[PDB]
Nucleic acid binder design. Structure first.
Lengths: 235, 206, 433, 396
RNA sequence: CAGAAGAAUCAUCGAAUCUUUGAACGCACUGCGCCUUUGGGUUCUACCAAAGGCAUGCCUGUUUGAGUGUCAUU
RNA sequence: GAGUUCAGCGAUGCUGAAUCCGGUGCGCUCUCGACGGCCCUUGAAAAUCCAACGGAAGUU
RNA sequence: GGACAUGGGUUAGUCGAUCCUAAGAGAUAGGGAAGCUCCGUAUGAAAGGCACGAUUUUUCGUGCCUAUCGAAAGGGAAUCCGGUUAAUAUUCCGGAACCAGAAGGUGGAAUCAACACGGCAACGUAAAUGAAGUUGGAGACGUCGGCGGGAGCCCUG
């Protein structure tokens, strides 16, 4: 008996020509789909949301200078759930300070008064909780990207981590994980090196693919321990 | 070229109903409620959809368990459907808003409805498609829908919608509905039939 | 009898083209491919392709007519048809705005079991165990990939569960034989019921999806492999007397305890028996726990590597302390500090290696392949002319097919590889001296 | 056996496991593995159980049968152009060679002397079979000269003359010319009958009269073919009984002159036939071909060739069978001459044993031309090879 | 007549068998096809056999469609 | 080696021989080739088989 | 007696039928008709195929091309000799062939100069890939007269 697995009946030439043709059809469509019309209700709906945010910001800041500061944990996980057009400039600036300048961006932050105040300011747009060891390890091992030379580079090898953070006694992904979980001395440097995660909602089910405005049911505000479940769906 | 016979029939029927002079009671169904007001009407309608057979079964079993183990309700609120039922509601002057499908195939089923609603002082609109009405009441098709009672929350939403249908359907048209429809002729077709007519009038009379 | 027509029997009757098989089965191309994944149906080439294609010369793939005839009576094809009916009913329910009916449809979504597919594909457990290497390689590959739209999150969870249950069985039965740290990953090699099972486990790193592979094809393979490993693991646990599936310790799994969550409650295999190993926070715990515990050794690890650590860094019961970091500020005593290659060489050779030669900051002696078998002359790192000329120059054509031509490959690659590495030893000795 | 720190080759070497990166192509390889499991056609063979290819060859025992011509030792130099053809006298002491230069050189084999420098393009030249009549028939263009050099004894010159003293007949540093023969076409190949009364001339250009038979006793020439079909490449006489072999472009035809008929047609299976040689037994024919192929024909075996040989990398020019020793040689444009041991049994069940013996090399190539003609010494295993550089090699 | 010894050219009758045809139904009227499954052989990509299927109109439902038929979709 | 005809000798067997060389003809029968007319009414169809143009594809 | 009674007798891959079409018939599409039924045969019929593809949001996309009956005298793959019976023979017996289809195998042939060479030519040869698409030929074609060739028969040494 001698089985031979010959070359596949795939015709790799016309295979990649079909691939390039599909990509060319894509760039044509993306360039074509421009300048949709907007109806007056959307403009009013945006204004009502903006004034809704303005009332919330004044109430939260003025006469409510109190924040509950989730305790028994020195680490927090924050993800940008939503976003509005013509966002108030204060919200727009706080989002970039938290490095949550794009939707589905996730950031590890240190549990303190300063972050909590900014997190209360941007509460409707962010979901945050307490990440456990399994989530932190899985996020770093699967969706962790480092800012090497200032570009988004995958943390595939410990050589880059040693080169980029050797001066802080950081040589491996596990060193990154230990620093992040325990909020070590170089937590500030590690977080800056880490690129924000991209936890886009996953639509695997046929119902998920069809329903409108699907975001996995991501609620806003403080969830506590539920963010581990949200992380588990993404990683 | 060779179209299938049923496709040719559909397309000839489309053109034929355009060319022929259409009596005003049938021509009124070519003027329908505009898209913005229809969308607002269906927004109110979708708050009063009748319960699905599965939802109805769930509610009744819930009451059955209470009766079985250990045991006052408010009157339901929903949109009214069925041609005979809605006609009785208009004639009883209970309908607040009548929504007539624009493409009921035997048009005689609803050809009298706009006039009947006019005689009874019922606000009515002719809305696109029997299938949109059907989806509201969980059916395939609804020839007509009626709003008779809403909750006190939605009294203002109905009143605003009734006002819009007044302005955007009845205030508009009105004179349009009283005119024979049809006679719609293509640009080059009217010139072509003029050539046919003059040639016919020359000597083709027999 | 009338004149028999050409192309009515033989190869032209036995073989069927892919497009004719599509029309025969009334399937789409994707659906036909999927059942070929689930069953075993692969292309076959006739000796005379032009004769098998009714005289045509156009490039064509062929299948057995009997293979496609077997697909006609396959129950799962109707499950694909039942799904398409489902998918349209859901669209109508969502189009007509009936959320609760669509939810009921999604709950009652048609499913199928590969029970009969596994049995008919593998009549005997021995036949199954032989063809498990690809299943394990795929499952372990996907247990580390991030969840995406193409691949199910629950599908990922099944891969993690099935891989861990398999690792637990091999640890319990001490079936592991060889472990090879290659650039690709870790090549494990166990023997179960006499069959040699070899699978590769990749390293846990933050890779990116290549975006050039079709996850639809790999979805069907993963679906089939998960069914196969579930039934294989069920028998293996029952043979050992364990209950299947092993109970889940959700809190420990959420605390990243790994294998500790999966409790195996009952319903040179002692190379490391008298050793209490400890793992620092720079080493592949997922691999080191498996190899050591497969030989009876006790294992402790840094808490950041996971919860459920039976030992602690302060506990002096530690005999060996794996630490691949080039520095230890916490240098204990009696806990001889080694590197993982010391371990893996021990499983492969079955003999305790040199701790000092594998101590922290070592020269790292070369890693041997426990799978490469020594060749006839390949260098393992651990008067005549007037007769030979005629001997090789007559039958260079005194035959008909000249099948002797395979020396030009066989002797070349074997000898040049031997000559190249028999030269490397000469160069390395010269550099040393 | 390629890993972090492998000694087998230097993939990549990594100082430590921690530094080892993630293999990016692992997903692609498993994807290709999955693709192969359902897209790669599968064929079940016999696996050709381990069997080194050297078991297939047969045993020649070349040492047991060693009349092998070793490396050349006598080098004849002086010819300034390609030696078109060369021949050795029946005595074996005189070698007459000629080429495009038009210079006929008669060499002494034992010493390499050029005793006869007299020139008098030399298409071909063949000696007479009768020792007492050492007459050499030399063809230049359409003219053939019967030259009897005065090197031979005077009575031998007279013994050459009285043999004779379509094609028209006519009757200088010892320019002893006897009977010049002029033909319509440029004669290419010359053959002598065993008794010397008949001379066969073949020309490829001609069609109707491509082959001519010249009777010296009658001093006349004729065309033995009433109607000739196909181009004629070479001509020769059967060494035992009166047959004439015509090696055409694609066939070899045996013609009975006594009965004026055809005997056999050998299908060489070859695009172009170069030359033919006949074993002295008369039932074995060797065909040199422009298809780089040597075809051995056994007259009692089949019309098809008994063996096919394709060692040569270039077109095979000439093939010569040793009259006595069971050896034959093939010379081609590649410059290499192949010496084969061909031994013939008279038994019907006994298939003749053909084996290679040597591949003679170190010969020049000029204008993509190598060995043009080869001749066998009548006494021992000595081969005369004429090259395109004007060199003659004594393969002893 | 021979031959046989719950008999019977018996009765009843609720289980079956029921060739080719015929409204007569794969197509024709000695034949010629197609589809599915299984089996045989002293020969196995071939040949053979067996079993079960393949008429028309219409109804109910199912599935898959078609339509420059009527619409909806920020 | 069959068949036929002669000689024998003994289930129908066995053994001898011969079955040959010609010549021919507006001969008859059948067929083929090459022409020459008359056509006009310029002289069935299909199954089936072949070839061409075309250039897809492609040490083991 | 070709009667009565009793038994026997017809053997085929190659011979016919079986297959194809002819003038015509004829079901179907449709339309008549109170109706048995009639008209109608590509007719205003959705009149049936082939290829391509790493699987395509694991719900199929793209491209191409678009009945039957009617001839034991027409068209059509292939068998001969001798012998044998009471009665059957191109069928059986003995011997010798042929045709059609089917797979592998053996040997030969062509190619990393991609699918052979030769001849001025007509064309030749042991071979010497050819998808879609487009053509050509055979089948396949009146009648009469004379001449030539061959065979058998007749004549005859």
């Amino acid at each position: 008996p001698e089985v031979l697995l010959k070359k596949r009946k795939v015709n790799e030439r016309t295979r990649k020509e079909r691939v390039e043709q599909a990509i060319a059809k894509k760039e044509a469509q993306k360039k074509n789909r421009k300048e949709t019309f907007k109806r007056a209700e959307t403009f009013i709906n945006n204004y009502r949301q903006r004034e809704r945010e303005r009332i919330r910001l004044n109430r939260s800041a003025k006469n409510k200078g109190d924040i509950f500061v989730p305790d028994e944990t020195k680490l927090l996980f924050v993800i940008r759930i939503a976003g509005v057009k013509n966002m108030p400039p204060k919200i727009r600036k706080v989002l970039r300070l938290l490095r949550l300048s794009r939707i589905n961006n996730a950031v590890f932050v240190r549990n303190n008064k300063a972050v909590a105040q900014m997190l209360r300011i941007v509460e409707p747009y962010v979901m945050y909780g307490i990440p456990n060891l399994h989530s932190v390890r899985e996020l770093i091992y699967k969706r962790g990207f480092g800012k090497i030379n200032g570009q988004r580079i995958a943390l595939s090898d410990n050589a880059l981590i040693e080169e980029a953070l050797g001066k802080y006694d950081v040589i491996s992904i596990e060193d990154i994980i230990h620093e992040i979980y325990n909020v070590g001395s170089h937590f500030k440097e590690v977080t800056k090196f880490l690129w924000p995660f991209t936890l886009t909602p996953v639509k695997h089910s046929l119902m998920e693919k069809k329903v409108k405005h699907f975001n996995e049911g991501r609620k806003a505000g403080y969830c506590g321990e539920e963010i581990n479940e949200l992380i588990k769906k993404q990683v | 070229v060779k179209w299938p016979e049923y496709i040719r029939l559909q397309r000839r029927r489309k053109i034929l109903n355009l060319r022929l002079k259409v009596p005003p009671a049938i021509a009124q169904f070519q003027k329908t409620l505009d898209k913005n007001t229809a969308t607002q009407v269906f927004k109110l309608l979708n708050k009063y959809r009748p319960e699905t057979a599965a939802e109805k079964k769930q509610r009744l079993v819930a009451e059955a368990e209470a009766v079985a183990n250990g045991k006052v309700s408010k009157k339901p609120y929903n949109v009214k459907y069925g041609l005979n039922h809605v006609v009785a509601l208009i004639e009883a002057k209970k309908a607040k808003l009548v929504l007539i499908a624009s493409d009921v195939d035997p048009i005689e089923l609803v050809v009298f409805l706009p006039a009947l609603c006019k005689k009874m002082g019922v606000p009515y609109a002719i809305v696109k498609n029997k299938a949109r009405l059907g989806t509201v009441i969980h059916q395939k098709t609804a020839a007509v829908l009626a709003v008779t009672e809403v909750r006190e929350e939605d009294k203002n939403e109905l009143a605003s919608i009734v006002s819009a249908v007044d302005a955007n359907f009845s205030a508009k048209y009105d004179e349009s509905r009283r005119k024979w429809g049809g006679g719609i002729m293509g640009g080059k077709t009217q010139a072509l039939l003029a050539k046919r007519a003059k040639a016919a009038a020359a000597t083709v009379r027999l | 009898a009338r004149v028999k027509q050409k192309g009515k029997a033989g190869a032209a009757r036995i073989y069927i083209t892919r497009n004719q098989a599509l029309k025969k089965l009334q399937l789409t191309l994707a659906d036909f491919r999927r059942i070929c994944i689930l069953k075993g149906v692969y292309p076959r080439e006739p000796k005379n392709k032009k004769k098998a294609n009714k005289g045509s010369t156009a490039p064509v793939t062929f299948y057995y007519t009997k293979d496609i005839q077997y697909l006609l009576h396959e129950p799962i094809v109707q499950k694909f048809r039942e799904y398409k009916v489902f998918a349209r009913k859901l669209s109508k329910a969502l189009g007509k705005g009936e959320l609760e009916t669509a939810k009921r449809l999604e709950a009652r979504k048609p499913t199928y079991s590969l029970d009969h597919i596994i049995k008919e594909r593998y009549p005997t457990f021995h036949d199954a165990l032989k063809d498990i290497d690809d299943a394990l390689s795929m499952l372990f590959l996907f247990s580390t990939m991030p969840v995406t739209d193409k691949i199910g999150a629950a599908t990922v969870a099944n891969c993690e569960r099935l891989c861990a249950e398999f690792q637990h069985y091999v640890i319990r039965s001490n079936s592991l034989r060889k472990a090879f740290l290659s650039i690709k990953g870790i090549y494990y090699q166990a023997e179960i019921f006499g069959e040699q099972i070899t699978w590769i486990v990749p390293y846990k790193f933050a890779q990116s999806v290549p975006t050039d592979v079709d996850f639809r094809i790999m979805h069907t393979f993963l679906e089939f492999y998960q069914a196969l490993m579930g039934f294989v693991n069920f028998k293996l646990y029952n043979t050992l007397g364990l209950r299947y599936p092993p109970k889940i310790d959700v809190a420990k799994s959420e605390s990243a305890a790994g294998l500790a969550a999966y409790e195996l409650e009952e319903s040179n295999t002692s190379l490391f028996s008298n050793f209490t190993f400890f793992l620092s926070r720079e080493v592949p715990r997922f691999s080191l726990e498996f190899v050591i515990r497969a030989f009876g050794g006790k294992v402790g690890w840094d808490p950041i590597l996971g919860s459920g650590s039976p030992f602690s860094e302060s506990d002096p019961v530690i005999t060996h302390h794996i630490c691949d970091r080039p520095h230890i500020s916490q240098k204990y005593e009696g806990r001889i500090y080694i590197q993982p290659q010391w371990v893996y060489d021990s499983i492969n050779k079955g003999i305790l290696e040199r701790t000092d030669l594998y101590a922290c900051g070592a020269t790292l002696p070369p890693h041997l392949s426990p799978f490469v078998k020594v060749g006839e002359n390949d260098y393992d790192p651990e008067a005549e002319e007037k007769e030979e000329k005629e001997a090789k120059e007559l039958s260079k054509m005194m035959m008909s097919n000249k099948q002797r031509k395979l020396y030009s490959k066989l002797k070349n690659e074997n000898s040049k590889n031997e000559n190249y590495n028999n030269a490397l030893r000469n160069r390395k000795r010269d550099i040393e001296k | 056996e390629e890993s972090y720190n492998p000694p087998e080759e230097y993939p990549k070497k990594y100082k430590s496991l921690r530094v080892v990166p993630a293999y990016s192509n692992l997903i692609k390889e498993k994807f290709e593995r999955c693709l192969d499991l359902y897209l790669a056609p599968r064929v079940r063979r016999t696996k050709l159980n381990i069997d080194p290819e050297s078991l297939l060859p047969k045993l020649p025992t070349p040492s047991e049968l060693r009349p092998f011509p070793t490396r050349c030792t006598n080098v004849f130099i002086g010819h300034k152009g390609r030696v078109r053809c060369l021949s050795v006298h029946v005595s074996g002491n005189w070698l007459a060679s000629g080429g495009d230069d038009g210079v006929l050189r008669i060499w002494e084999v034992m010493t390499g002397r050029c005793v006869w420098k007299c020139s008098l393009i030399i298409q071909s030249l063949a000696w007479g079979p009768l020792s007492d009549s050492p007459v050499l028939a030399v063809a230049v263009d359409e003219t053939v000269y019967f030259i009897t050099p005065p090197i031979f004894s005077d009575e031998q010159i007279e013994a050459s003359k009285e043999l004779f003293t379509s094609a028209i007949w006519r009757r200088l540093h010892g320019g002893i010319v006897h009977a010049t023969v002029s033909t319509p076409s440029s004669i290419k190949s010359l053959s002598w009958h065993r008794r010397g009364d008949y001379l066969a001339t073949s020309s490829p250009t001609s069609s109707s009269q491509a082959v001519l038979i010249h009777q010296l006793s009658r001093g006349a020439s004729q065309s033995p073919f009433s109607k000739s079909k196909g181009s004629v490449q070479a001509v020769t006489f059967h060494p035992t009984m009166p047959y004439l072999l015509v090696a055409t472009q694609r066939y070899v035809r045996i013609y009975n002159l006594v009965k004026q008929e055809l005997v056999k047609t050998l299908l060489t299976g070859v695009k172009w036939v170069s030359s033919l040689s006949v074993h002295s037994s008369g039932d074995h024919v060797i065909i040199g071909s422009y298809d780089k192929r040597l075809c051995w024909f056994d007259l009692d075996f089949s019309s098809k060739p008994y063996k096919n040989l394709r060692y040569h990398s270039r077109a095979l020019r000439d093939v010569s069978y040793h009259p006595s020793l069971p050896l034959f040689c093939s010379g081609s444009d590649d410059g290499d001459v192949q010496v084969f041991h061909g031994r013939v049994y008279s038994d019907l069940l006994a298939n003749p044993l053909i084996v290679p013996l040597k591949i003679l090399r170190n010969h020049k190539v000029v204008d993509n031309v190598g060995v043009l003609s080869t001749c066998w010494h009548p006494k021992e295993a000595w081969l005369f090879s004429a090259g395109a550089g004007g060199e003659i090699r004594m393969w002893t």
